[PDB]
Amino acid sequence: NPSARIMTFYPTMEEFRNFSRYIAYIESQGAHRAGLAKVVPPKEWKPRASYDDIDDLVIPAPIQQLVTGQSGLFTQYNIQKKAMTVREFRKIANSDKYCTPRYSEFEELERKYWKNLTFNPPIYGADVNGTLYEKHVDEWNIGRLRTILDLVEKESGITIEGVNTPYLYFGMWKTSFAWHTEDMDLYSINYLHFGEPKSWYSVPPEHGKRLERLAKGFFPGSAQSCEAFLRHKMTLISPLMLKKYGIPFDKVTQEAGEFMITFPYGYHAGFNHGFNCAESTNFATRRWIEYGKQAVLCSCRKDMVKISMDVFVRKFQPERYKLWKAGKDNTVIDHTLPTPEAAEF
Ligand SMILES: O=C(O)c1ccnc(-c2cc(NC(=O)c3ccc(O)cc3)ccc2O)c1
Ligand SMILES: [Mn+2]
Ligand SMILES: [Zn+2]
Numbered sequence: 001n002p003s004a005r006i007m008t009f010y011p012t013m014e015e016f017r018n019f020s021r022y023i024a025y026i027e028s029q030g031a032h033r034a035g036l037a038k039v040v041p042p043k044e045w046k047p048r049a050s051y052d053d054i055d056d057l058v059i060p061a062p063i064q065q066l067v068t069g070q071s072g073l074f075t076q077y078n079i080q081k082k083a084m085t086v087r088e089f090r091k092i093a094n095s096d097k098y099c100t101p102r103y104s105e106f107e108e109l110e111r112k113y114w115k116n117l118t119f120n121p122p123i124y125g126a127d128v129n130g131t132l133y134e135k136h137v138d139e140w141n142i143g144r145l146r147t148i149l150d151l152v153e154k155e156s157g158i159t160i161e162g163v164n165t166p167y168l169y170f171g172m173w174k175t176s177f178a179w180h181t182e183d184m185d186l187y188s189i190n191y192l193h194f195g196e197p198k199s200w201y202s203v204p205p206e207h208g209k210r211l212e213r214l215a216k217g218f219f220p221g222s223a224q225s226c227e228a229f230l231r232h233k234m235t236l237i238s239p240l241m242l243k244k245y246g247i248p249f250d251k252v253t254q255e256a257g258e259f260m261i262t263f264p265y266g267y268h269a270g271f272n273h274g275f276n277c278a279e280s281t282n283f284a285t286r287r288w289i290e291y292g293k294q295a296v297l298c299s300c301r302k303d304m305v306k307i308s309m310d311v312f313v314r315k316f317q318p319e320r321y322k323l324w325k326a327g328k329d330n331t332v333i334d335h336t337l338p339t340p341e342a343a344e345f
Pocket of ligand 3: 225226227228229232298299300301
C-alpha cells in the first residue's frame with residue numbers, strides 16, 4: 001500500500017472465523033500502513049439478537065466534554081457528571097439542544113463539527129465496562145479474541161480495564177476522541193453496535209513522528225511538562241491545520257455494524273454523528289512487541305497504562321533478551337513490514 005490509504009475489507013464467512021489470521025491477511029495487503037482499516041462482516045453475521053434490554057443499563061461516569069481553543073487547535077477538558085442510564089442518555093442525546101443537525105453531504109456535517117466544537121458541551125458516556133455480545137458469538141468476539149495480549153493476564157493476573165477487557169462507549173452529537181495512539185502503542189478494535197455514524201481521522205504510522213513534532217510546537221508548555229503529552233488524549237487538531245502544515249492523513253466514516261481496526265503507533269481522532277454505541281478493546285500481534293519496547297509513555301502522572309514487556313521478550317525474542325535487559329538492543333522499527341504471522345500469505 002504505497003499511498004498508505006485507509007482500506008475497507010469484506011471477508012466472506014469462511015475468512016471471518018479466525019481473527020488473528022484475518023488481521024495478518026490485511027497486513028499482507030498493507031492496510032496497516034494507513035494506521036486504520038475498516039472491516040465489514042458478512043451479512044450473515046450478528047453479535048446480538050436485539051438491543052432492547054439496554055435502556056436500564058447504567059453509565060457509572062458520564063463525562064461532559066468542554067472544549068477550549070481556536071484556529072484548528074483545541075484542548076478538551078473532561079468534567080465528570082453523575083451516573084445515568086441508557087434510557088436517560090438517549091433522551092438527552094435526541095433532545096433538541098443536543099441532537100444532530102440536518103445536512104446534505106458529509107463535508108457539511110464535518111464543517112459544522114469543527115465550527116461548533118466549543119459550544120453546547122455534550123455528554124459522552126465513555127469507559128463503560130461491559131459487552132453487548134451474546135455469549136455464543138465465537139467469531140470476532142471483542143470480549144475474548146484470543147491474541148497474545150492474553151499473555152498479560154495469564155502470567156500475572158493483571159486486568160487493565162479497556163485494554164484487555166472490553167469498553168462500551170455511548171456517544172451523542174459532537175462527542176469526540178482526541179489525537180492518540182493506543183496505550184503501549186497496541187492495536188485496537190472498535191465495533192459500532194448501533195445508531196449514528198462515527199467519523200475517524202488517521203495518520204500513517206510512518207509519519208506519526210511528524211505529528212508529534214507539530215504537536216510539541218503548538219503546545220510547548222505541555223511538551224515541556226511531559227515526555228508524551230498526547231497520551232493525555234486531550235488534544236484536538238483540525239484536518240485543515242494538518243493540511244496547512246503538510247501532515248499526511250486520511251478520513252473514514254464508520255457506520256453501525258462495521259469494525260475499525262487501529263494499528264501500532266497509528267495516531268487517530270474523530271467524532272460521533274449522533275446517539276450511538278460502540279464497543280472497544282486493545283489487542284496485539286508479534287509485530288506489536290517491538291513497538292511495545294520502544295513506546296514513550298506519559299511521564300507526569302500515576303495510574304497510566306504501563307505494561308511490563310519482560311514476558312513478551314523472553315517468549316518471542318529470546319535471542320535479544322540479554323541485550324535488551326542490558327539496554328543495548330538498538331533495533332530500529334520499519335513501519336511498513338507486516339506481522340510474521342502472514343507467512344501463510
Ligand atoms: O471515542 C471512541 O470511540 C474512541 C475511538 C478510538 N479510541 C478511543 C480511545 C479513548 C481513550 N481515552 C480517551 O480518549 C480519554 C480522554 C480523556 C480522559 O480523561 C480519559 C480518556 C483511550 C484509548 C482509546 O483507544 C476512543
Ligand atoms: Mn484509540
Ligand atoms: Zn503526562
